[PDB]
Amino acid sequence: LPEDPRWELPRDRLVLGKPLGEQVVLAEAIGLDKDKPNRVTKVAVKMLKSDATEKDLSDLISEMEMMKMIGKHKNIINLLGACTQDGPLYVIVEYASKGNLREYLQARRPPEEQLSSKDLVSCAYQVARGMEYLASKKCIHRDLAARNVLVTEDNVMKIADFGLARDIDYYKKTTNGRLPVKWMAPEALFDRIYTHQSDVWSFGVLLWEIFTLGGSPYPGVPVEELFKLLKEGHRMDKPSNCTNELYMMMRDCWHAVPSQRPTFKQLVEDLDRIVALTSNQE
């Protein structure tokens, strides 16, 4: 692979640690900042498995290239560097120590600390803000879900896996046992049309995830029945601990007509206003 001095980190500056998932490992980067050479930064490192193919390799390269082009934002997982020469490819990104948003929410359900109502709307605001940034860079996520929102040590929401490329198996489940089709806009599901508007649909489901503290959409509903519910214009029930305003936001994101859904810019503005007016006293 060609070297890119914008992003290259010498392999001996990266102390590999425990696995995070399967491939991703936790690591320590020494002197990530050229300006700051004696500091260690915890980072996440993506790499290929021992059984990887040329196609596997080409995908990793493309995710890394897309991240360079998209640029930095507080509410996405940012590229921090790469080891590309003389050894396996390592793509180094920001580490999110409190896991994904689903996990983060579930672990804070009533019997870590509790989340106020302000906190929950703030999560939504941050994700909307991340997505508005990505939209502005012409990036379409195609699988926006709480599982692909990671949470940092300082509780910042960061959108992950935005830079991946897509081929899709509707019956394939996530490691946690859920079906990705349950976040897909109908035009994306039925006509394989993916847009910013179809991501906004997904964001509506994500909002539902947040206000159910990590609830699972359509529990017990298989793919074939999900199709029928969508064709009949079915819409998930309003969560308890959810204002009428936020529920109408969900329903708007779920407009049958893609052009009538709000944009991410509009959602960021509305959520901004709602955060300020939402109590943190419970």
Domain ranges of the chain: 1-95, 96-276
Per-residue b or e along 45-78, where b marks 16 or more CB atoms closer than 10 Å to that residue's CB: bbbbeeeeeeeeeeebeebbebbeebeebebbbe
Q: Which value in Å is the resolution of this experimental model?
A: 2.2
Report the alpha-carbon distance of residue 78 to residue 229 in Å, rounded: 37
- Sign of the Cα pseudo-torsion (242, 243, 247, 252, in order): negative
Q: How far apart are CA 226 and CA 182, in angstroms?
A: 7
* Binding site feature residues: 20-22, 46, 94-96, 100, 147, 161
Fold topology of 96-276: Transferase(Phosphotransferase); domain 1 (1.10.510)
- Which helix (H) or strand (E) segment holds residue 15: the answer is strand 14-21
Known binding-site residues for ATP equal 20-22, 46, 94-96, 100, 147, 161
CATH superfamily placement of domain 1-95:
Phosphorylase Kinase; domain 1 (3.30.200.20)
Q: Which residues contact 111 (CB under 8 A, 6 or more apart)?
A: none
φ and ψ at residue 158, rounded to 5 degrees: -130, 125
CA-to-CA distance for 38 and 173, rounded, in angstroms? 43
Experimental method: X-ray
Q: Which residues carry out catalysis?
A: 143
Q: 202 near 183, Cβ under 8 Å? A: yes
Tokens of 114: 């509790």
- Please check whether residue 188 is in contact with residue 198, taking contact to mean a CB–CB distance below 8 angstroms: yes
Helices (H), 154-239: 186-191, 196-211, 223-231
Q: Is 232 left (phi over 0), alpha (psi -120 to 50) or beta?
A: alpha
